[model samples]
Target chain A: VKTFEDLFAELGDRARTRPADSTTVAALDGGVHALGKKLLEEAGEVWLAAEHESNDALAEEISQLLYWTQVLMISRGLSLDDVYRKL
Target chain B: VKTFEDLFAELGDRARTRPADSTTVAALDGGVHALGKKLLEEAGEVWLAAEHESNDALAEEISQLLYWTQVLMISRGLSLDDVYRKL
Candidate 1:
């Protein structure tokens, strides 16, 4: 979750206007479609992990899903605060 | 987010071992594919809202994304704590 805050800052410049040699950057640079596709893929992995893998394994996948979600959020200029309000 | 805890409780039986007249139940009863699909759909809507709608709209979609995510999390017995540890 704190990592999400860091992502928001890192992606802030390009996004507000963009990662380092960062996956976040790569995903953002790849465009919305790229990230969303990756998002779905991670989500599937989460399902698979939950069914057959340990909670630890599922947690890893879920973490990835949340990471990609935050990446997508920043790429589109959405903030954690923005997301928090709705929750 | 606290609501997620409620889902963990509500879906406890069928999931641990299943909402009211709840959307949560509807999604859970529909099975993994159903909820994961909804998760992805909400993700897409988040993207679209970020691009074309207000931040508020995007936030709403993001909220839906989180809700569906927690549902998926519980459906497969992945706890918020499980995911939190990875993060």
Candidate 2:
């Protein structure tokens, strides 16, 4: 089935082949600070979701959090394995 | 060397194997509206960065914008391929 692997691979490929205006390239090109700020903001929202709600609400909040984390990783040229192993 | 494929693949793998509280899972759990709002906000920032700043600043804003876009896509259960094919 399609997965984050497919999602990220396509992004990397796009960064290589797509126009300079492509979304993936734009994301991959950003500063670490900007990406970090977004990640932290999203993570806090996820925390609030977890604290105030349960089940589906929390799950939804977590999804955005993870997405932002991945974006942060991609910006820094880090991988999930790096994060996973670090954790 | 590492790549986005490796990064996302690891996240997908973690979502399957890691604890529910993990960052990857948290991001995967968020609402589309929240994700969309963040995406729109970032995109606007990118536009502003592009218009007011040059090169690096614009690139940084675009990075955040792209990151938010992917978060929105993941929230909607879409993939980069899906986004690419549609574009």
Candidate 3:
């Protein structure tokens, strides 16, 4: 997968067949607003890391950010292309 | 690249240089409590989706869940490796 969206496709497929007991599935049971708040939280971490942390630390925080962002987009039925077009 | 942690490595690298103004970074500014709440919220969605939604809907909700879970781990300085081992 070349883009995060592509990677997300992989996740989406796995989500379909994975057992209900899977932690991933269990977590989703939490709802959209919960995920949205997390997306925002990770966004803040990226900012804090950028300002005070090392380049490596910053990168780690950003990864944390993308992981959440992708979820928010998926929940809302949005795509990375939609994001790119907007930017 | 076999595990979610492997994928996390890729995200970690990208977060390093992406612009500060990127939505991902901004969202993270919300802090851990907010994200934690979101994470729990998405978990509830998955539960609802499983009972009321189609398989595709359930899959989408699960993906949303995983996304937040990853962030919660990173924010706490934990890793998927740790997660896997604990499971």
Candidate 3's displacement at residue A85, Å, is: 18
Candidate 3: CAPRI quality band: incorrect
Compute the TM-score of each model's chain A versus the native chain A and list the values.
0.78, 0.67, 0.76
Model 1 agreement with the true structure over A1-87: per-residue lDDT tens digits: 256566456455534431111345446668999889988999999999989999989987887787778788877878789998998
**Model 2 residue B6 CA deviation in Å:** 28
Weakest ten-residue segment in model 3 chain A by summed lDDT: A18-27
Error of model 1, residue B27, in angstroms: 37
Calculate each model's fnat, 2 decimals.
0.00, 0.00, 0.00
lDDT for each residue of candidate 3 in A1-87, tens digit (9 for 90 to 100) = 366766577546545755322333433556788888877888888899888999999988887677667666666778777888978
- Model 2, A1-87: lDDT tens digits are 166555556545655764322434545576778777877887888888878887888876776576556666677777667766875
lDDT of each: 0.68, 0.62, 0.65
* lDDT value, residue B45 of candidate 2: 85
Taking the tens digit of each residue's C-alpha lDDT, what string does model 2 give over B1-87?
A: 154344445445655764422343445676676767777788788888878888988876775565555555556777667866776
- What DockQ does each listed candidate score? 0.02, 0.05, 0.05
Candidate 3: tens digits of C-alpha lDDT, residues B4-44: 66546644443454432222234355578977898899999
Candidate 1 ranges with C-alpha deviation above 4 Å: A1-7, A10-20, B1-87
| lDDT score of residue B84 within candidate 1 | 80
